């Protein structure tokens, strides 16, 4: 209202402080903003960013590099995404490193106990698939570590974390979509077990807002000791899987030449649903994509 040098008091009146200007702003996507926050917290814990620079992945890494039987409902269609255009990949370290050890493991035992009983053919395992499990990229970074482990480093406990979009297609779900974005964390060192996993989940899920309060056993094929984790915010006295975790199995593990004293722990969860939680949103079919 002011343009007056001499004319100080020609006042109209010094006349409501409940409003906003509300003009053009220009904004960032919420999900990448969440991604930001997560990278912040992870690098705060002392983690190293992995490289999920891929969008398609052979079945071997997808299923068989892990103890996942080929004859399975996941491998069955209608619940995964299959590329089939370049359905063929070549070059994995057959040479006393991965392939024939794993083939043995689905048909016999090694690197620990014995037993999987199946016709582990290679070709179907070699069919290129669209990611349903981000851990694939994760697992790659293990084997290279494997070689590092052998060269000179005996015990260098490593912490890794990965996030990028993954997808499945059941048909059209009334709750979930084609898996916007998935977080995953992995710790690896000598002789590590549950207590460490529980402690670190407590720490993390404390940093997110909640306080881990309950963990319930679940059934999972790549991590035999698995669980569904729960921390408490005022949703109901019921719940929904607030993410999962578990530690891997020497079956796939010792097949990269890791030590016998080597144990690793992992956990994964969704990125959209926590966001839905944060900014008080429902039915994320407008938050993402259109009507955003």
């Amino acid at each position: 209202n002011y343009l007056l040098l001499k004319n100080e008091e020609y006042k109209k009146y010094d006349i409501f402080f409940s409003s906003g200007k509300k003009i053009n702003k220009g904004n960032i996507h919420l999900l990448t903003k969440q991604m930001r926050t997560f990278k912040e917290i992870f690098f705060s814990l002392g983690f190293e960013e992995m490289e999920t620079h891929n969008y398609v992945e052979s079945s071997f890494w997808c299923f068989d590099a892990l103890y996942i039987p080929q004859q399975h409902p996941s491998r069955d269609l209608q619940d995964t995404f299959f590329i089939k255009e370049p359905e063929t990949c070549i070059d994995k370290f057959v040479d006393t490193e991965y392939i024939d050890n794993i083939k043995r493991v689905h048909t016999h035992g090694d690197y620990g106990s014995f037993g999987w009983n199946y016709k582990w053919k290679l070709e179907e395992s070699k069919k290129n698939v669209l990611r349903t499990h981000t851990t694939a990229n994760s697992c790659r970074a293990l084997f290279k570590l494997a070689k590092e482990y052998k060269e000179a480093g005996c015990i260098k406990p490593k912490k890794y974390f990965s996030i990028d979009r993954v997808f499945r297609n059941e048909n059209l779900d009334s709750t979930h979509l084609a898996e916007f974005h998935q977080v995953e964390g992995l710790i690896i060192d000598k002789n590590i077990g549950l207590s460490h996993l529980i402690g670190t989940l407590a720490a993390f899920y404390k940093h997110i807002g909640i306080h881990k309060l309950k963990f319930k056993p679940t059934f999972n094929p790549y991590t035999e000791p698995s669980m569904e984790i729960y921390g408490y915010h005022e949703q109901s006295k019921k719940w929904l899987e607030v993410g999962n975790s578990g530690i891997f199995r020497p079956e796939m593990l010792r097949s990269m030449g890791f030590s016998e004293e080597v144990s690793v722990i992992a956990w994964g969860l969704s990125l959209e649903r926590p966001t839905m939680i944060k900014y008080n949103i429902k039915n994320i079919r407008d938050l993402f994509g259109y009507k955003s």
């Binding site: 002011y2 010094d14 409940s18 200007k21 106990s113 549950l194 207590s195 679940t218 199995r249």
Partner: protein, 522 residues
């Protein structure tokens, strides 16, 4: 899995009285899970998740049995078909639907559209003649025992008669159901013998658990897993005494055998197990029994997460400015209309939030403008703004930083350095108290979406408010202090500066400004 679980009748099969709200707890502590579950008009029932790792929980019988035991209670290479029968038995409807359920589960669940999967059950009250069938294709055919067929001959081309619900074909892709019989038989086809015995032995355990043999024309085998104890000790994160192990394995139907070098045990795994070779699972079960929760197991950020506002701020054309180090006293006392200080603050500054003034002076400094450090950034900005009053029409600037004051207690050196930020508008015509309000509101929409207005609309805790106040540097009735807590801790101000200072600072165009602490934000 699926939700094929069944009626409440279990409470009888268990012969106990533990109400609901006291059962779903145990399932959640087990591995089983159920969403809202419905009733068949007069029968209060539920449905259950049931993992397909073990076939022991696939059926209502095996499930209820495991729950009972759980807590502290007690030439064409033909696919080798096997066919076993019993001696005596008895069925009813509540058991007819269940045997049909298992016939539907071993087929749907275990069968991947039933390639090496099929169920060939019937009764042992028809014939008993020994025979062999493995042959070439066939020699003749007359009929077959299926419900949608009652003539078997006359029109439909042979070897092929295809009509059923969904998966009608199997070749290229009745007589009596024996309802309420006493003798019972069953046939089944498999790929070869290992998975044959695997898929077949399950039907055996149905009911007091005794069945005639099977005709062996040319069986239940257990296995063993050795486990070291320090292995499990490290994994599960506990310090078990290993007798607790025998107790746990008893409670989960695992008849261990205790081969003990003080550091080793050996468990006897049957077929009715979520079978997996490495004895890892063993610890999975010991942990289920011990309880995940009952393990003995056993931080702030400012300059990295502050740039949020900075990013949000440079949006909308606001540019950042780096202040000068320090400013002359009169530049903060005489130029500004405030001149004040709380030297012997002791009452004042009872808590170091609230952007204030109590400045720290400097000896042996430059005699031009270097007498005291900043306390509110706007002045230095104004100094900058007094230097470039010739640029484009709307000048909008801001700055975050660290500042400093003298502190009586609370610091080893009796001095404090806290970071806050200020922002400034000028357009030669108006102020921007409308724009600036939108801005402030947007930032606090970037952390809280709550100032005061539109309430905490229904479509609300620990948020702020703008209280109008009176400080001389700004124009009356057009100045507001800002505050946020259940402790009434004011930390921000928003106002239109009083023109007399502009006369002091050789300013010409109208400006509006905001100044808020951040170090307080939390």
């Amino acid at each position: 899995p699926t939700i094929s679980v069944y009626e409440d009748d279990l409470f009888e099969k268990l012969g106990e009285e533990i109400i609901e709200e006291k059962l779903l707890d145990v399932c959640f502590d087990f591995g089983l899970e159920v969403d809202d579950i419905e009733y068949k008009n007069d029968k209060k029932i539920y449905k259950i998740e049931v993992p397909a790792n073990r076939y022991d929980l696939i059926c209502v019988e095996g499930l209820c049995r495991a729950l009972k035991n759980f807590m502290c209670k007690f030439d064409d290479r033909r696919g080798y078909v096997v066919c076993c029968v019993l001696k005596n038995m008895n069925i009813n409807d509540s058991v007819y639907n269940n045997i049909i359920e298992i016939q539907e589960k071993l087929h749907h669940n275990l069968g991947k559209k039933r390639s090496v999967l099929a169920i060939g059950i019937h009764d042992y009250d028809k014939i008993k003649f020994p025979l062999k069938y493995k042959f070439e294709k066939k020699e003749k055919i007359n009929f077959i025992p299926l419900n949608e067929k009652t003539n078997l001959n006359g029109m439909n081309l042979i070897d092929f008669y295809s009509k059923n619900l969904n998966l009608k074909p199997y070749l290229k892709i009745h007589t009596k159901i024996s309802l309420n019989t006493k003798n019972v038989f069953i046939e089944c086809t498999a790929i070869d013998r290992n998975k044959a015995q695997i898929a077949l032995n399950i039907l055996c355990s149905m009911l007091k658990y005794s069945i005639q043999s099977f005709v062996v024309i040319y069986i239940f085998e257990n296995k063993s897993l050795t486990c070291n104890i320090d292995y499990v000790r490290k994994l599960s994160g506990i310090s078990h005494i290993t007798v607790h192990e025998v107790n746990n394995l008893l409670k989960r139907m695992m008849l261990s055998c205790d081969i003990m070098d003080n550091n080793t045990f050996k468990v006897t795994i049957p077929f009715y197990r979520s079978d997996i070779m490495h004895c890892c699972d063993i610890i999975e079960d010991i942990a289920i029994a011990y309880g995940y929760g009952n393990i003995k197991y056993e931080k702030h950020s400012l300059n990295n997460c502050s740039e949020l506002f900075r990013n949000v701020l440079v949006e909308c054309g606001y540019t950042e400015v780096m202040t000068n180090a320090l400013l002359s006293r009169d530049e903060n006392y005489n130029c500004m209309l405030r001149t004040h200080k709380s030297y012997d603050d002791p009452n004042i500054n009872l808590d170091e939030y609230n952007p204030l003034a109590a400045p720290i002076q400097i000896k042996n400094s430059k005699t031009s403008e270097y007498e005291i450090i900043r306390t509110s950034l706007i002045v230095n900005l104004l100094k900058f703004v007094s230097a470039n009053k010739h640029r484009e029409l709307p000048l909008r600037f801001f700055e975050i930083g660290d500042v400093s004051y003298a502190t009586y207690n609370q610091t080893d050196t009796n001095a404090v350095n806290k970071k806050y930020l200020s922002i400034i508008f000028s357009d030669k015509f108006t102020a921007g108290l409308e724009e600036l309000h939108g801005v402030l509101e947007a930032i606090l929409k970037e952390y809280q979406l709550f100032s005061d207005y539109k309430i905490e609309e229904k479509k609300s805790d620990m948020y702020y408010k703008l209280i109008p106040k009176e400080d001389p540097s700004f124009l009356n009735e057009r100045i507001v202090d800002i505050v946020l807590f259940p402790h009434n801790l004011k930390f921000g101000v928003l106002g239109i500066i009083h023109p007399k200072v502009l006369e002091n600072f050789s300013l010409d165009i109208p400006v509006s400004a905001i100044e808020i602490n951040v170090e307080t934000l939390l």
